[PDB]
Ligand binder design. Structure first.
Ligand SMILES: OC[C@H]1O[C@@H](O[C@H]2[C@H](O)[C@@H](O)[C@H](O[C@H]3[C@H](O)[C@@H](O)[C@H](O[C@H]4[C@H](O)[C@@H](O)[C@@H](O)O[C@@H]4CO)O[C@@H]3CO)O[C@@H]2CO)[C@H](O)[C@@H](O)[C@@H]1O
Ligand SMILES: OC[C@H]1O[C@@H](O)[C@H](O)[C@@H](O)[C@@H]1O
Length: 199
């Protein structure tokens, strides 16, 4: 039971987030002023979360564009579940999840397409003992609760575009080249659970 996410908050640089409710589209732009981050206004306790996403065109080296759940962005003891595109390679996506601030569960998935070629569908199914990530209707990763932590705090839905080139000496997302700015990441038909908003 899903519904469109129409009520959002923008955490910084609102001049780089657009929302067109009539087209069910939210855009994030990265350029010399940085990027931006949107989120739901409510947290949720489990459920299915989805969006169509078309990633930015051109040489996206250095950038991270994403969609994720987190209990609170910036909290050092967060729970979170992520899809993160690594801009040096638009034919992969990274998944990860955090439990009381501990991540280190990265996995790299080959998309089979360029994530900027059009809209593709990304889904996170979050339950108390099972998390699944889906791309274009196919499960790409499943994980189960196992005593070494599981995301359980209520979480917001978030998405951002940011320059991650400073992380790990550029090895994670690449150096930021910037030659094709502005970089525009499009989120369409963002859906959140009907019954699980908390509060
Ligand atoms: O200059 C304007 C404004 O900038 C503020 O700082 C920004 C900063 O520029 C930006 O790079 C940083 O980006 C965040 C990003 O929004 C967020 O989504 C991402 O979250 C990670 C998360 O931390 C991980 O654990 C995980 O789950 O993956 C997600 C997604 O990648 O983290 C990055 C890096 O922090 O956001 C800053 C704001 O929070 C200044 O604070 C402000 O003063 C300036 O006005
Ligand atoms: O710097 C923040 C980043 O660190 C990386 O190691 C993690 O894979 C990401 O999930 C996270 O966004």
């Amino acid at each position: 039971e899903a519904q469109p996410l129409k009520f959002i908050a923008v955490d910084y640089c609102p001049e780089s987030c657009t929302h067109s409710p009539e087209s069910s589209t939210i855009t994030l732009t990265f350029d010399h002023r940085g990027g931006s981050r949107w989120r739901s206004t409510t947290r949720f306790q489990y459920g299915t979360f989805s969006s169509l996403i078309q990633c930015p065109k051109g040489n996206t080296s250095g950038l991270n564009f994403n969609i994720y759940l987190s209990s609170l962005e910036g909290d050092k003891s967060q729970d979170a579940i992520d899809f993160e595109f690594l801009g040096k390679d638009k034919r992969i996506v990274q998944t990860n999840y955090y439990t009381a601030g501990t991540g280190n569960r990265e996995a790299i998935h080959d998309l089979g397409f360029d994530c900027s070629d059009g809209f593709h569908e990304y889904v996170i199914k979050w339950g108390p003992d099972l998390i699944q990530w889906l791309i274009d209707g196919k499960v790409i990763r499943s994980v189960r609760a196992d005593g070494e932590g599981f995301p359980q705090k209520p979480m917001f839905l978030y998405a951002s575009v940011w320059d991650a080139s400073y992380i790990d000496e550029g090895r994670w997302t690449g150096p930021y080249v910037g030659c094709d700015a502005p970089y525009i990441c499009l989120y369409k038909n963002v859906n959140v659970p009907v019954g699980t908003a908390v509060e």
